[model samples]
Target: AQNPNCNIMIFHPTKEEFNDFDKYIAYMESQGAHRAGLAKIIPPKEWKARETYDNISEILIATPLQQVASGRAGVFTQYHKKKKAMTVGEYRHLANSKKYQTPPHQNFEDLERKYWKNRIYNSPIYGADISGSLFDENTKQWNLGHLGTIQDLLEKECGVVIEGVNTPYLYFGMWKTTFAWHTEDMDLYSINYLHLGEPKTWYVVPPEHGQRLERLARELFPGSSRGCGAFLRHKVALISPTVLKENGIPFNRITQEAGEFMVTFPYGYHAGFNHGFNCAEAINFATPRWIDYGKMASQCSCGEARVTFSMDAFVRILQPERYDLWKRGQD
Candidate 1:
């Protein structure tokens, strides 16, 4: 996390402006982690799954252009195989130098500056919704402009203010570093803004279609459980939209350029690949929308596979705000 501390705050300046801005922020906040019911635009020639247009009602588009900033900070990440699992960012420091990454890997110093320009040196990010890596002592602080305490609208409406929900993790992407098809953890929302990087390609499935896609995923990989994601230590699926259309599935594809924000809502499934060497930051958030889907697990269709979920603590955390918002109805 030694990258410069710049973040969303670099754009906005004051609380007054923030106050006025909140009125404009999407509260239902779905705009992205979206559903077919609220779809904006459908894809063309999506023959996969042979779906019809009647229930679809003008194709549901997945990417939400508008976004809200903060919610929770924990991340779904792991980098391990043998000894134990650890975040790569944590291990980046343990090595003697920024030389080759692993055994049999080439030496960083051997490559010429010309070849170095295109060389890919790193790896994916998954959406697990668990606590992410902790900040090291040498980690630099972000220049969190006026955007601090971004949970304004969430707290006002949900009575829950979570700072980590808004904590951001910086991704050091190299060629082909990819994020597989997945939705945010616990059905919460997420925001990923590319601070600086070669363009990134994002493929999204509407919540309705996203669920259908998950089901198909299970059929394709019955061995994979808990949402059909093959989140194994050595396996990750990099699926493309064109392929889904062939399967008769529908989705939206967009390229997120540097400095743009791509937000995914509760149930939307989104996946992307880093075009080249780039650095980007991502943060998480939760609203009243998350009241019911707290990070509890659920049984996979395969009954033998177990899913345990409890909204008790989540309900309690958000209880006051939910009650307060309802009380406002008295006005």
Candidate 2:
């Protein structure tokens, strides 16, 4: 059952309030809003963006096996099946189809398997890059590709383009389809804009509680975490809020509606599921404040292999004028 409290903060930003993205977000951060791990923003009703792609339809989707023991039908676990593809129109048809509507209380697994075999898919269209495809280049505010909105110091300062980090990725979700618990790559901040469709339910663990969640995950999934310290990045684990609360890990629940933005802070762990069919665009970014976290992330103690780009050289060449002034003077 969803938490009754649902205590996460929600900000309703009008056109004027949403204009200066940096100023508004900086103020939000200053207010310790980021301490919640995730913050939700509802954009004014007049705000709009292209949410559809008529030319695009057929796409791959994940179909992880459902957890039978969990009792909760939506709590999916395991990842042994191959990905399946279907057109966006077909997905909508099947998702709302009457064949799977009856609550299979007695023979749930049997029904699910039959549905799965018949191409009645249950999944999320995850991490499909749409950086150059969507968003008007002329638009500045709320544009995922706009460097000004993301305030990505790395790109602004280093001119580096990190795919899916700086570039945007699109997500197509249906009922009960979930994104497993994980932090953004490189532990950078991430923002997701729900352009259309039903709300998404999110569970976020603040940075301070990061290690606690890690400890719980390690304890629960020993084999996975034992070999890879960053096993959460595997996107396979799904711990309930009840379990988190029992384990004394603090978390916040947020239901992100259409025309809303959800931002995850650096080192913050978040996992979520869509209420129904929906479209959202997300991208990771880094601010100047992310420097220390970025530096610390480079010092991972695990044997887990990660492709990393050193920020040292970028930092050194960050200010060309400073280097010139130093060259003209002493070391």
Candidate 3:
């Protein structure tokens, strides 16, 4: 009469507690487990056509954050900073500017050469097309990268499955391109876990918060739409797990023993501040399909017609040759 999936049943040490699992269940019956009204899970086969937030679950995984932090530093210092000097604002302006053109393939070649010549070990930045590479010519599709391998390793080690349903081999995270925060289409779940160092503080705000921020940005910038998505102007929050105590956020703590703490957020904006230079890693699993929500609202939308920007494009434009490693099994 015991559930094998119960954390308390498995993790609780001693035979007395194990034998008292029935009593623990009785106690839970007396004191009802608090249930947060998060979204429900809808299997891909049974999904309706309407947009729903049923599948997104922020699952955090345990990994040494130092490994990733060192990797980030190596990329930024040896590659990102040296290759291009575009601020987030400048990048935005360039994205929408008529004067700005996507860099030529030759420019990418220069950056690609630098990537292969660099000394960083297994850095994701080198395989990026944004920095330049001849490999940017391949079809734009998302392929499993070193990060994907890392996710697979974590899944095997932790016994936790954190991957897209359709594309189980691929895991979502920030790529070497613009760290633009966008929501995925279909019933996708995302989890970001920070480990191995002091917890970074992050803010999470709701969708309405994003609208207010967008209004403020438009008002402040006058003719500029560049900063509209700057703050993810939706329901958002700033959370610092290490700096701020659990009591700081009203809904911060929950009964993990009951598995009753999961929260399903819809297009909520969350940002973090890592003050002490710590290590952090986050995993996102979602449906791989991309939908253009903004396009249906207006006919003036111009640009590419893909549901989502392809990771293949990023790799092809940034590191075409090295990107082929995924096919070569060198990944």
- Give Cα-based local distance difference scores for all models: 0.40, 0.61, 0.25
For candidate 2, the TM-score is 0.72
lDDT per residue (tens digit) for residues 1-331 in model 2: 1223324567787788878877777877776777777888877776766645554455433342331222233323434243455555666665556532223334434433332332224433332333343555665677887744233476665576533233677776655556678887557788898876766788898776788888888887777767766777666677776677778888877678787889888888898666556778887777767656654542223423332233223323443433343233222
Give the range where candidate 3 is weakest over 10 consecutive residues by summed lDDT. 126-135
The residue-by-residue lDDT of candidate 1 on 1-331, one tens digit each, is: 2112111111222333333322323422222224421211111221111122123212111211111111111112223222233343332222213342222324322222222232223322221222222223332222112233325545666676644324555554443445656665445566565555455666677655565776555555445545433232122344445457667766766666664556566666676555544445565555555445433322122222222232233333545434343233322
Clashes of each: 20, 0, 34
- 1-331 per-residue lDDT for model 3 (tens digits): 2222211111222333323322432343233211111221111232222233233223221121111122222121212322334332333333334432222335433433332233233222111112111111231211111123322433454454444222221111221221212232211233332222222222333332334433433443343345223322221212222222332321221111111112223333333222111222222332111111211111101221122223333233334453464223312
Clash list (residue pairs), candidate 2: none
lDDT of 3: 0.25
lDDT for residue 295 in candidate 2, whole number 0-100: 49
lDDT preference between candidates 1 and 2, better one: 2
Candidates ranked by lDDT: 2, 1, 3
Candidate 2: 10-residue stretch with minimal lDDT = 64-73
